[PDB]
Amino acid sequence: TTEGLDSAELFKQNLTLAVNAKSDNQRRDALAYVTNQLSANPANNPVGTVGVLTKVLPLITDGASSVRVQLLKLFRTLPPQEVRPHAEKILLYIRGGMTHLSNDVRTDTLNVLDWLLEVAGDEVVSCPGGWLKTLNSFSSMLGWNPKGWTSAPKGPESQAKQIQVLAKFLQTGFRPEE
């Protein structure tokens, strides 16, 4: 029945099933439930923002597109002031997700990067490796990199999203400061 357990144990169990479950629908339902409780009350977080981020950041490169969308919803739900101090590890996860082979997870990782930029722009552009490594990743997955053979240059909606996220990243990095 799972009714004698308290809301904290429900939170921890559903987080554990969201991380370790072998069913895409089960992971989607667990992520939706924890997102619903975080939306209803931010104080209903027994494991904290750091623990939530540490558990759900490997789920960026998940093959399930619905799970990725619900993870983005959780990220947008998650409080920005608590997101701000941990920008570096998240940026490592966006770099891995952009470098991942699949174009769908590349696009959803760009969406996560857009969320990170609109939530905490300064920490992203100021943390160690947040500028040049991100620019290297952008150049690599745009194909914009600077023995007798020549190489051919390396869809449309994906490239448009890539250029838009790059433009927003450059605008955030060179935003006029007062």
**Nearest 5°: CA angle at 88, between 123 and 23?**
125
Q: Does 154 bind RNA (CB under 7 A)?
A: no
Q: Does 3 bind RNA (CB under 7 A)?
A: no
Query: How far is 105 from 98, CA to CA, in rounded Å?
Result: 7
Q: Does 99 bind RNA (CB under 7 A)?
A: no
Q: Does 151 bind RNA (CB under 7 A)?
A: no
- Could you tell me which stretch among 20-28, 58-66, 94-102, 151-159 binds RNA (CB under 7 A)? 20-28
Q: How far is the CB of 161 from RNA (least distance, A)?
A: 28
Query: How far is 31 from 18, CA to CA, in rounded Å?
Result: 6
- Could you tell me which stretch among 22-30, 79-87, 101-109, 133-141 binds RNA (CB under 7 A)? 22-30
Spatial CA neighbour of 97 closest among 113, 87, 109, 89: 109
Q: How far is the CB of 149 from RNA (least distance, A)?
A: 18
Q: Does 23 bind RNA (CB under 7 A)?
A: yes
Q: Are 37 and 43 in contact (CB under 8 A)?
A: no
- Taking each helix axis from N to C end, the angle separating 156-173 and 132-142, rounded to the nearest 10 degrees, works out to 160
Q: Does 41 bind RNA (CB under 7 A)?
A: no
Q: Does 147 bind RNA (CB under 7 A)?
A: no
Residue 17 dihedral angles phi and psi, to the nearest 5°: -70, -35
Point out which residues bind RNA (CB under 7 A). 2, 22-23, 26
